[PDB]
Subunit: 78 residues, 2 copies
């Protein structure tokens, strides 16, 4: 579904689920490679069975068009 | 010397870096350690920082394995 919109700070959030820890870390690495390609970085939370990806522009204190674009590119990884 | 947070009780420490790529590289080393030991942390990776949290889910708190994993994490440095 659509990315969640959390607050303080405003940011786009989505969780991706996995059967273990290694696959979650592997996916986080794909998101990280995407971040490096686009030069816009997320906050990633990796744990057994899940990766939480959060997109927001730090220098802006909130969400910008780039964040929405990164969210879409993250979905396109699958 | 790791910080101890609550709800749930867990060991926490943040490692800093000059960028994002190096932070993720470090998180992967912690992840490899976790996979070999079969005990998993909660890792938070962002520009300039990796937060590592150790605790036992089956117990909903800290157990001896967590203290060891914390020391092994520091050893990576």
């Amino acid at each position: 579904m659509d990315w969640e919109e959390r607050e303080n700070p405003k940011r786009l959030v989505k969780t991706f689920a996995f059967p273990n820890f290694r696959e979650a870390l592997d996916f986080a690495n794909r998101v990280g490679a995407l971040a490096e390609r686009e030069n816009h970085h997320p906050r990633l939370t990796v744990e057994w069975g899940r990766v939480t990806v959060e997109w927001w522009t730090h220098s802006a204190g909130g969400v910008t068009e780039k964040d929405r674009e990164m969210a879409r590119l993250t979905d396109a990884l699958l």
